[PDB]
C-alpha cells in the first residue's frame, strides 16, 4: 500500500547508519565503498584530487541508492510484518474480566481489570462477554467463536475436562457460559506468541541463513581481493585505474542483490507463514519443514472433527437395552471426556429416568486415564468398567471373565462401519458395545492426493480398533495406520523414524500426543488443542486442518528456493558486469581491451555507470520476487534443480546483458554521459 | 592435425581409466583399512618395529601427525641443502644453498610444489636429489594421499570420531602404492634412455670439436616419483623436456599417464568405498569434461601459433618456440594442460613461450584451485570442497538441506570449506599484488608488456596452488621471490589441509540418511554440469580481472 511504501522508505533512510549496516557485511562493504566514493567526489570537486568530479558523484550517489534499496527491501518486509502485528495487537485488547470467589459455578463475581489477572485465578465468561485470558476450562460447556484469533466465523465447541477444554484469550462466547482458569501469566499468552513471531529485534538468523551468509561473505572476500589488487596490476601496466571505478567494480561483483534481499526473504517468509494461519515461533522449524518425509497424524481431532457422539447402544446376548444404557450412563458420569458426556446424552434421549448425586451413591468417581483406557464407577460391592476393546479384554481376563464370540462379531461390525466401538462390563459379564461414530473434518482425502505427490507420507496414529482405524484411514486416504497404540507407542514410532534419518512431523491435537509432538522435529499444533501441546509444538495451526503442513512445506521450500536462486542469479550477474567494467576501466591503459567489449556500450564512463545503475535497480525489481518467494511447482529433485537453474542461472546471465544495454541506451538518449 | 589431437586425447584418457580402475580398487582397500593381498604378514612386524599400533586417531591427532611429518621433513631438507657440501655423493664440489634458496627449495618439495629457482645440474648435488628431494616427493605425495584417505573415511564412516591411523596410512601408501609403481616406471624410463647412475659428470669432445660437460645422476628414480606423486621436481633446469629426464615420446606418454594415474585412481576408490560407483564416475566425468575442453583450447591456440613466424618466412605458424622435436605441438599442449591441471608442475614445454591463450588456460587451471584431476590427494579434496559448495547451492535451490552422500552439510562445515576455498586465491592475489608493488618483484619479468605481469601472476599462482610450473622466464632466485613463494606455497598446502581435516572431523560424527524420494541425486549429467559450472564460474569470476591484464591483454595486442 502507499502508506507502507512511504513508511518503509523512511525506515530505509533511517537504516543508513553504519551501526545498522554493521550486521550485514555484504551491504557494509557497499556502504564503505559508497562512503569513500562520495568522499573522493567531494574532495575532487573541491580541488584536492584530479579527474572528473561529477562522475564520482554519480557513481557514489548510485552506490548510496544501492544501500538505500537494500534497506528498502528489508524495511518493506519488516513493515508488512509489523502491520500484521499491529492488527493482532489491536485484537488483544480486552474490555474487563469477572472473577469468582469459589471454583464452583454460581458464586459471586466481581469486576476486575483484565490486566490484573494472574496465574491460578478462576474467571467466568457469560454469553456476550469475551475471554479475558488463555487457560483451561474447568466447568461448563459451550460453543465459542474463535474468529478473533483465526479469522473464521465458524463456531467451535469447548467443554470442560477433555481435549477441547483449551480456551484462547480474545475469543467471544455467545451460546452459553463457561468457567475457565487462567494458567498463563501476563506476557506469555498465545496472543503474545504471534507478536513474538512477528516483532523484530528477536528473530535470529536460521542455520541455512547463516550458511548462505558465510557463502556471501566468502565471495565478498574474493571480489574485494580481486578489485583491490587490480590497482597495482594496472598501475604497472600504465596509468592506475581510478579508485572510483574500483569501488564500482567491487560493488558490482559483490552479491548485493541477494545481500540486500536476504533479510527481506526471511521476514517475508514469516509474514506469509502468519498469512497462512500458522504461528511459527522460529523460522528454523519452517525451513526444517521442507525436508519432512513422514507425516504423523492424530485420528481424533486432527483427521476427524473430534468429540465423537454416541449413536446407538447394541446389546450382545441376554442383555436388555435399558440395562446397557443405564450402566453406560453410570460409568460415563465419572468420565468428563466428550465420549462420556455423549453417552449420557444418548441415555437421556433414550430413557431420561432418575438423577445421580455422588453422595446418594457414596462411591468414588473413577476418572478416565489414557493409560488405563477405561473408566467406571465403584458402587456398593460393584465394580463397573467401560473402555476400549483391548482394555476391556485385559480387565475381563484379569477378573476371570471371558469375552462372548458374538460380542466380538458386533464389535468387528461396528468397527467396520468406522465408529470407535467401546465395550462396557458390569462385574464379570460384558453388557454390550456402544457406537461412538464421528464426522470427518475437512476435504482431507482430496488434499493428501497432492500431498503424496511431493514425497510426504502420511501415517495416522490411532488408539481405536483395527477396523475402525482402517475405515477412517480409508476415508482419510492416509498411507498407513496404527491400532491399539498407547502414547509411548506414538513416541516410539517417531523414535523409529528419526533413527532412519527421516524428519518426522506431527500434526496432533490432544494432551495425549503432547510429548510425541515435542519429540518430533517439525510439528503442527492445532488451535483445537491444549496449551501444553501448543507450547511444545514449533508451529501452531489456526485452521485446525491436518494439511496445514502442506502450506508449511510450500513456504519453507519457497524460502530456501529464493535464497539459493538469488545466489545463482547474483553470481551469474557478475559475468555480464565484468563484460561492462573490464573494457571500460582499462580503456586508458590497454586500448586493446576495448575490443573485448561485446555489449557495444557507448563510453567507458557510461559503461561503468550502466553497470552500477543496473546493480542498484535489480534490487528493486527483485523486491517483489523476494517478498512473494519463488512460485515453485511440485517437481522431483533433479527436475526442480533443472527448472531453477534454467530460469535463474540463465536469467542472471542474460538479464544483465540486456539490462546494461538498456540502461546504456537510456543514458545515451538522455545525453547524460 | 585436429584429428590427430583428438586421437591423442582419446587414447590418453582411455589408457588412463584402464590403469586407474585397478589401482582405484587397491587404494579403496587401503581407505577401508584392509591390507593388500599378501602384505598382512610383513605389516605386522613393520608396524611392531616402528611403534605404529593401529590406534585410531581423531581429526586432531591425524592432522597433527601429517603436519608433524611435514615439519620434520622440511627441517631435515633445509639443513640437508644448507650442509650440502658436508655430505657424500658430491662429484661436483659445489657449495650448499643459501638460506633463501635452501628455505624455498625445502618448502617447495615438502609442500609438494617442487617450485624451482635453481638449476639442478649446477646447484644441487646427487645427495640432495637422492636423499633430499626424492624422499620429499614420496612423503609429500603420501601426506596428500593420507589427507584424502581421511576425508573419504569421514564421508563413508557413520557417527564415528576417528579417521584411521596416519602412520599406517603413510606407511602403506609409500611402501605399496608409491615405491613399487614408481620402481616400475623408473625402470621403464631407464630402458628408454633415462639416466640412473652415480658417476661424475662426463666430458664430451664433440664431433665438431667443442667441450660439452654432460650431467649425470640418479634421474630415473626421481623421475618416476616426480610424475607419479605429481611433484614435478625436475632433476635439471629443463624439467621434463630434458632428453635425460624424458628421452622418448613413449616415456612422455607414460609420464602423463603417471601424472593422472593416482588422481583418477583416488576418484575410482572414492566411488568404490562409498558403495556407489556412480559418485566416482560423476567426479571423474566432471574433471574429464573440463580437462578435455582445456586441452582442446590449448591445442588449437598453439596450432594457431605465432603470426610473426609466418610473416618472417617460415613453413607455418606452428609455435615451436618453447617446444621439443620429440613431442609435437599437440603433445606439448596436452602436457601443458596435464601438468597444470593435475598440479604436477612438470613442464615439458616452456610455458613462457606458449601463445597468449595457450598459456592462459594452464594459468587458469592452476588458479581455479587444481580441481581437474588435481594433485595427488590435493586435487580430490579440493574438488570435494567444490562439491560441498555445489551440493549446498543445489539443495538450497531445491528447498532441501545440503546433503552429500547423506551427510548433511551445515554451518560449521560451510565455514571450513569457505576458508579452504579462500586460502589459495587469496594467496595468489595478495602475493601477485606484493610482487607487482615492489621493485624486486617486478625486476624479475623477462618479457615486457602484459606478458610480464602474466609471468608474475603465473609464478605466484603456481606457488600458491602447489603446482610448481613456472613460466621460467621470471627469475625467482632472488631472496624476496624465494621468501614470497615459500610463504605462498606453505600456506597453500597446509592452510588448505587444516580446514579439510576439520571437514573430515566434523563429518565423521554425522550419520548418513538413506536415498529418499527428494534427495537430489548427485550422480548424473545434471550434477556433473552443476559442478563444472560451479568451479568454472567461481574460477572465472575470481581471476578474470587478473587474467585480463595478463594473457588476454597479450592476446588482444
Amino acid at each position: 500500500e502507499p502508506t507502507l511504501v512511504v513508511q518503509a522508505l523512511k525506515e530505509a533512510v533511517k537504516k543508513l547508519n553504519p551501526q545498522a549496516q554493521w550486521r550485514n557485511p555484504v551491504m557494509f562493504i557497499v556502504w564503505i565503498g559508497s562512503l569513500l566514493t562520495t568522499c573522493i567526489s567531494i574532495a575532487m570537486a573541491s580541488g584536492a584530487m584530479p579527474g572528473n568530479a561529477l562522475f564520482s558523484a554519480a557513481i557514489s550517489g548510485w552506490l548510496w541508492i544501492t544501500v538505500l534499496f537494500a534497506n528498502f527491501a528489508e524495511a518493506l518486509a519488516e513493515g508488512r510484518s509489523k502491520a500484521q502485528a499491529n492488527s493482532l495487537k489491536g485484537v488483544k485488547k480486552t474490555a474487563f474480566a469477572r472473577k469468582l470467589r469459589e471454583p464452583k459455578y454460581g458464586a459471586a463475581a466481581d469486576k476486575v481489570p483484565a490486566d490484573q489477572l494472574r496465574k491460578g485465578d478462576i474467571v467466568l465468561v457469560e454469553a456476550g462477554d469475551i475471554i479475558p485470558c488463555d487457560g483451561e476450562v474447568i466447568e461448563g460447556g459451550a460453543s465459542v467463536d474463535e474468529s478473533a484469533i483465526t479469522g473464521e466465523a465458524a463456531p467451535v465447541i469447548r467443554e470442560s475436562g477433555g481435549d477441547f477444554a483449551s480456551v484462547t484469550g480474545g475469543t467471544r462466547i455467545l451460546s452459553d457460559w463457561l468457567v475457565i482458569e487462567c494458567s498463563v501469566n501476563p506476557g506469555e499468552t498465545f496472543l503474545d506468541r504471534m507478536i513474538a513471531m512477528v516483532e523484530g529485534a528477536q528473530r535470529r538468523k536460521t542455520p541455512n541463513e547463516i550458511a548462505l551468509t558465510i557463502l556471501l561473505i566468502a565471495l565478498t572476500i574474493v571480489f574485494l581481493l580481486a578489485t583491490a589488487t587490480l590497482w597495482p596490476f594496472s598501475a604497472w601496466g600504465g596509468n592506475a585505474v581510478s579508485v572510483t571505478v574500483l569501488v564500482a567494480l567491487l560493488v558490482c561483483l559483490i552479491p548485493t542483490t541477494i545481500g540486500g534481499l536476504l533479510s527481506a526473504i526471511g521476514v517475508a517468509g514469516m509474514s506469509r507463514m502468519l498469512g497462512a494461519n500458522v504461528i511459527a515461533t522460529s523460522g528454523r522449524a519452517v525451513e526444517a519443514a521442507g525436508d519432512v518425509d513422514v507425516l504423523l497424524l492424530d485420528k481424533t481431532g486432527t483427521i476427524t472433527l473430534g468429540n465423537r457422539q454416541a449413536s446407538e447402544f447394541i446389546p450382545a446376548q441376554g442383555v436388555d437395552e435399558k440395562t446397557l444404557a443405564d450402566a453406560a450412563q453410570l460409568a460415563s458420569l465419572a468420565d468428563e471426556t466428550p465420549e462420556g458426556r455423549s453417552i449420557v446424552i444418548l441415555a437421556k434421549q433414550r430413557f431420561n429416568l432418575r438423577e445421580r448425586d455422588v453422595q446418594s451413591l457414596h462411591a468414588t468417581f473413577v476418572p478416565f486415564t489414557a493409560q488405563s483406557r477405561m473408566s467406571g464407577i465403584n458402587i456398593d460391592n460393584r465394580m463397573i468398567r467401560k473402555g476400549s476393546v483391548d482394555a476391556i479384554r485385559r480387565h475381563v481376563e484379569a477378573n476371570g471373565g471371558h469375552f462372548p464370540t458374538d460380542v466380538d462379531q458386533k464389535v468387528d461390525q461396528v468397527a467396520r462401519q468406522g465408529a470407535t466401538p467401546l465395550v462396557v462390563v458390569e462385574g464379570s459379564r460384558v453388557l454390550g458395545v456402544i457406537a461412538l461414530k464421528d464426522i470427518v473434518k475437512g476435504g482431507i482425502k482430496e488434499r493428501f492426493a497432492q500431498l503424496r505427490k511431493m514425497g510426504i507420507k502420511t501415517v495416522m496414529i490411532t488408539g481405536d480398533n483395527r477396523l475402525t482405524a482402517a475405515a477412517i484411514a480409508a476415508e482419510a486416504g492416509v498411507d498407513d495406520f496404527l491400532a491399539e497404540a498407547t502414547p509411548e507407542a506414538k513416541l516410539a514410532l517417531i523414535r523409529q523414524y528419526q533413527a532412519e534419518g527421516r524428519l518426522v512431523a506431527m500434526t496432533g491435537d490432544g494432551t495425549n500426543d503432547a510429548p510425541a509432538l515435542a519429540q518430533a522435529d517439525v510439528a503442527v499444533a492445532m488451535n483445537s488443542g491444549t496449551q501444553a501441546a501448543k507450547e511444545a509444538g514449533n508451529m501452531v495451526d489456526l485452521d485446525s486442518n491436518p494439511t496445514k503442513l502442506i502450506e508449511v512445506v510450500h513456504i519453507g521450500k519457497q524460502m530456501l528456493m529464493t535464497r539459493g536462486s538469488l545466489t545463482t542469479f547474483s553470481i551469474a550477474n557478475d559475468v555480464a558486469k565484468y563484460f561492462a567494467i573490464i573494457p571500460a576501466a582499462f580503456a586508458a591503459t590497454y586500448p586493446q581491451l576495448n575490443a573485448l567489449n561485446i555489449m557495444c556500450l557507448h563510453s567507458p564512463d557510461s559503461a561503468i555507470l550502466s553497470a552500477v545503475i543496473f546493480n542498484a535497480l535489480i534490487i528493486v525489481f527483485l523486491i517483489p520476487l523476494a517478498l512473494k518467494g519463488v512460485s515453485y511447482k511440485p517437481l522431483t529433485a533433479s527436475a526442480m534443480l533443472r527448472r531453477n537453474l534454467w530460469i535463474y542461472g540463465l536469467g542472471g546471465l542474460l538479464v544483465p546483458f540486456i539490462g546494461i544495454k538498456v540502461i546504456d541506451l537510456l543514458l545515451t538518449v538522455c545525453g547524460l554521459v | 592435425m585436429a584429428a590427430q589431437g583428438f586421437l591423442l586425447i582419446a587414447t590418453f584418457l582411455l589408457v588412463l581409466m584402464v590403469l586407474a580402475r585397478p589401482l582405484g580398487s587397491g587404494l579403496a582397500r587401503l581407505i577401508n583399512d584392509i591390507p593388500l593381498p599378501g602384505t598382512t604378514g610383513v605389516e605386522r612386524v613393520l608396524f611392531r618395529a616402528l611403534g605404529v599400533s593401529d590406534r585410531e586417531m581423531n581429526w586432531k591427532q591425524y592432522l597433527c601427525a601429517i603436519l608433524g611429518l611435514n615439519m620434520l621433513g622440511l627441517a631435515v631438507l633445509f639443513f640437508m641443502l644448507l650442509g650440502q657440501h658436508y655430505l657424500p655423493l658430491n662429484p661436483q664440489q659445489l657449495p650448499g644453498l643459501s638460506w633463501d634458496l635452501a628455505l624455498n627449495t625445502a618448502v617447495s618439495f615438502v609442500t609438494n610444489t617442487n617450485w624451482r629457482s635453481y638449476s639442478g645440474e649446477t646447484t644441487l648435488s646427487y645427495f640432495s636429489q637422492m636423499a633430499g628431494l626424492t624422499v620429499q616427493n614420496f612423503l609429500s605425495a603420501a601426506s596428500g594421499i593420507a589427507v584424502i584417505f581421511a576425508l573419504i573415511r569421514a564421508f563413508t564412516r557413520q557417527s564415528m570420531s576417528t579417521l584411521g591411523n596416519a602412520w599406517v596410512d603413510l606407511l602403506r601408501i609409500t611402501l605399496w602404492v608409491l615405491v613399487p609403481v614408481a620402481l616400475l616406471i623408473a625402470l621403464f624410463f631407464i630402458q628408454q634412455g633415462a639416466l640412473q647412475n652415480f658417476l661424475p659428470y662426463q666430458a664430451v669432445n664433440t664431433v665438431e670439436g667443442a667441450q660439452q660437460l654432460l650431467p649425470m645422476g640418479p634421474v630415473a628414480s626421481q623421475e618416476a616419483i616426480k610424475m607419479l606423486g605429481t611433484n614435478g621436481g625436475g632433476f635439471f633446469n629443463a624439467n621434463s623436456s630434458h632428453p635425460f629426464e624424458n628421452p622418448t615420446a613413449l616415456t612422455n606418454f607414460v609420464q602423463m599417464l603417471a601424472i593422472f594415474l593416482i588422481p583418477t585412481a583416488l576418484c575410482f576408490a572414492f566411488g568404490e568405498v562409498m558403495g556407489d560407483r556412480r559418485q566416482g564416475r560423476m567426479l571423474l566425468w566432471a574433471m574429464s569434461v573440463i580437462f578435455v575442453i582445456c586441452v582442446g583450447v590449448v591445442m588449437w591456440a598453439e596450432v594457431q601459433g605465432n603470426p610473426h613466424l609466418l610473416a618472417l618466412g617460415t613453413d607455418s605458424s606452428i609455435n615451436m618456440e618453447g617446444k621439443e622435436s620429440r613431442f609435437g605441438v599437440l603433445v606439448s599442449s596436452l602436457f601443458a594442460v596435464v601438468t597444470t591441471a593435475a598440479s604436477c608442475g612438470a613442464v615439458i614445454a616452456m610455458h613462457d613461450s606458449f601463445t597468449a591463450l595457450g598459456g592462459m588456460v594452464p594459468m587458469w587451471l592452476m588458479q581455479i584451485g587444481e580441481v581437474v584431476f588435481g594433485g595427488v590427494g590435493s586435487g580430490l579434496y579440493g574438488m570435494m570442497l567444490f562439491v560441498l559448495l555445489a551440493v549446498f547451492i543445489a539443495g538450497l535451490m531445491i528447498g532441501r538441506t545440503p546433503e552429500y552422500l547423506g551427510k548433511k552439510i551445515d554451518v560449521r562445515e560451510m565455514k571450513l570449506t569457505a576458508l579452504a576455498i579462500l586460502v589459495t586465491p587469496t594467496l595468489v592475489l595478495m602475493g601477485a599484488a606484493l610482487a607487482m608493488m615492489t621493485d624486486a618483484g617486478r625486476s624479475a619479468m623477462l618479457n615486457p608488456g602484459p606478458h610480464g605481469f602474466s609471468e608474475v601472476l603465473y609464478a605466484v599462482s603456481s606457488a600458491a596452488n602447489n603446482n610448481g610450473s613456472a613460466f621460467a622466464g621470471l627469475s625467482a632466485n632472488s631472496p624476496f621471490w624465494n621468501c614470497l613463494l615459500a610463504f605462498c606455497m606453505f600456506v597453500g598446502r597446509f592452510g588448505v589441509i587444516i580446514p579439510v581435516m576439520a571437514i573430515a572431523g566434523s563429518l565423521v560424527s554425522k550419520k548418513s540418511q538413506a536415498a529418499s524420494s527428494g534427495t537430489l541425486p548427485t550422480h548424473g549429467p545434471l550434477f556433473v554440469g552443476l559442478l563444472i559450472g560451479t568451479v568454472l564460474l567461481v574460477g572465472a569470476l575470481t581471476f578474470i580481472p587478473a587474467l585480463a591484464l595478463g594473457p588476454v591483454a597479450e592476446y588482444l595486442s
Binding site: 557494509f28 562493504i29 564503505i32 547463516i210 561473505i217 565478498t220 572476500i221 574485494l224 583491490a228 | -
Partner: peptide
C-alpha cells in the same frame, strides 16, 4: 609507498579482516 597507497592497502586490510571476522562468526 606513497600516502595514497598506504591508506589504500590499510583500508583493504581492514575490510578483509572485517569480512573474515564476520565469516568466522554467526552475527
Amino acid at each position: 609507498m606513497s600516502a595514497g597507497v598506504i591508506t589504500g592497502v590499510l583500508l583493504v586490510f581492514l575490510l578483509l579482516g572485517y569480512l573474515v571476522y564476520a565469516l568466522i562468526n554467526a552475527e
